[PDB]
Design a binder for this molecule. Sequence first.
Ligand SMILES: Nc1ncnc2c1ncn2[C@@H]1O[C@H](CSCC[C@H](N)C(=O)O)[C@@H](O)[C@H]1O
Length: 264
Amino acid sequence: KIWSLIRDCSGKLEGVTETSVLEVLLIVSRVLGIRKEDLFLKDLGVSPTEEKRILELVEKRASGYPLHYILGEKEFMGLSFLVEEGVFVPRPETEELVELALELIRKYGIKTVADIGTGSGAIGVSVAKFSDAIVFATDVSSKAVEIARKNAERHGVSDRFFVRKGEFLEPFKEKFASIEMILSNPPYVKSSALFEPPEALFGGEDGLDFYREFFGRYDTSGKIVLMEIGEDQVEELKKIVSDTVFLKDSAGKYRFLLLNRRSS
Ligand SMILES: Nc1ncnc2c1ncn2[C@@H]1O[C@H](CSCC[C@H](N)C(=O)O)[C@@H](O)[C@H]1O
């Protein structure tokens, strides 16, 4: 059977994953070359090369290597984002930033938006696909820039999502002024601490370098700045940026900084 294979592949993963069966289900679909809902048909056996690939990938995973890198894909705001080693894998917590972002575009009629450190493009691509905004996106990784460009093509929004390599908004200076809302899910981990990129997790000794450099260099008058943040960085953020508000996600951990300097 392939349902035994499935059940043995998973015990192998009551390590790294809490959701071993589902991760097995997904690794199986991907080798068999199939949509996940096809696993249920009859005449669904898995023939060698196949069974071969599955324990292969299955153990590459018991190790802690990322599922989504194996899968080549991660769903975020209901969309399929291509991901590969070198790109940060979108996290569920971040969908919250986007829905808050969307509520903001509707509330104000915002038309131009930026997404600092785009990664796979999860934030800006979703904002583009689900609103009328135009989005300027940046990443220091040329590998993120690439994948993000394709995810934009992949979702029909290359005409409203532009990514440029470089840091912060340095590559879009010509556009700084016209930008109404600045979005980011930047590195915020105490570097005073895994297969995702360092550039993407680490925020210096205290995990704030990113905000210190940003609110330090950019004049934000007239703009709405919405950024994801570490659970424990509120009190210290209140001193780099004094007029910000701070929201909790669906869980109750503070997760977002909102600095609304739009007017009237
Ligand atoms: N100063 C900086 N300017 C622009 N991008 C930066 C940067 N510092 C880190 N990055 C980028 O920030 C991203 C952080 S990970 C988050 C990626 C994506 N926004 C998501 O939410 O899934 C990485 O892709 C990294 O390349």
